[PDB]
Amino acid sequence: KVFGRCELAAAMKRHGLDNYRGYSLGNWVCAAKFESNFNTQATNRNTDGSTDYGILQINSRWWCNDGRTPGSRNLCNIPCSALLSSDITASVNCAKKIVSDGNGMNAWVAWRNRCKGTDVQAWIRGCRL
Ligand SMILES: CC(=O)N[C@@H]1[C@@H](O)[C@H](O[C@@H]2O[C@H](CO)[C@@H](O[C@@H]3O[C@H](CO)[C@@H](O)[C@H](O)[C@H]3NC(C)=O)[C@H](O)[C@H]2NC(C)=O)[C@@H](CO)O[C@H]1O
Ligand SMILES: [Cl-]
Ligand SMILES: [Cl-]
Ligand code: NA
């Protein structure tokens, strides 16, 4: 599924991400836009042989199991394919664990390079929340 901007904002808010660990909803929408263009089916391969999955591009070296990343961890205890569903619950629940792991949202490279320090509130402008 390819989400609309306000549709995704409302879904993330319903799942408890607004101000989770101090990160306003606009941060999460901005990260999703530049990680996946709001597409739950997005995948991308990393140089080390791991793969990033879903709307928040969660990496298989650490967070999920895809059966082809030798010597990787599965810290969210889920198949990576679960992160590609039209239902974002699995991606959101894993993201909560990632952002609590010490480095905050700096775990998302596109957030650090394209959202951090910008007016992220503009990503939820006009939405009924
Ligand atoms: C969205 C996504 O998948 N992002 C990936 C990043 O998570 C990943 O960065 C590495 O993440 C691990 C796990 O969070 C980091 O290890 C943690 O580091 C903190 C302090 O730095 C420490 O307190 C934790 O105990 C430790 N956890 C474990 C299990 O060891 C690791 O430092 C991150 N590395 C870097 C360079 O940021 C990166 C790199 O694999 O990929 C993203 O796609
Ligand atoms: Cl915001
Ligand atoms: Cl933080
Ligand atoms: Na893994």
DSSP secondary structure letter of residue 69? S
CA distance 70 to 119: 40
Q: How far is CA 56 from the centre of its chain?
A: 2
Is 7 among the residues known to form the active site? no
Range of the domain at 8: 1-129
Cβ-count burial 49-65 (b if 16+ within 10 Å, e if not): ebbbbbbbbbbbbbbbb
Helix (H) or strand (E) holding 23: none
**Which DSSP helix (H) or strand (E) runs through 53?**
strand 51-53
Residue 51 β-bridge partners: 45
Of all residues in the chain, what percent are helix, strand and coil, respectively (each to 5)? 40, 10, 50
Closest CA to 26 of 100, 90, 111: 111
Structurally, how many domains does the chain consist of?
1
Q: 3-class DSSP state for residue 20?
A: strand
> How many other CB atoms sit within 10 Å of the CB of residue 47?
5
* CATH code for the domain of 12: 1.10.530.10
121 CA distance to ligand 3 middle (Å): 17
Instruction: In whole angstroms, give the CA distance from residue 96 to residue 99.
Output: 5
**CA–CA dist 52, 106 (Å, integer):** 16
Is residue 52 among the annotated active site residues? yes
Q: Which residue has the tokens 């990496």?
A: 59
Cβ neighbourhood burial of 117 (10 Å; 0-12, 13-18, 19+): exposed
Counting ligand 1 atoms within 8 A of each CB, the residue from 75, 96, 103, 115 with the most, and so the one to mutate, is 103
**DSSP H helix total and E strand total for the chain:** 4, 3
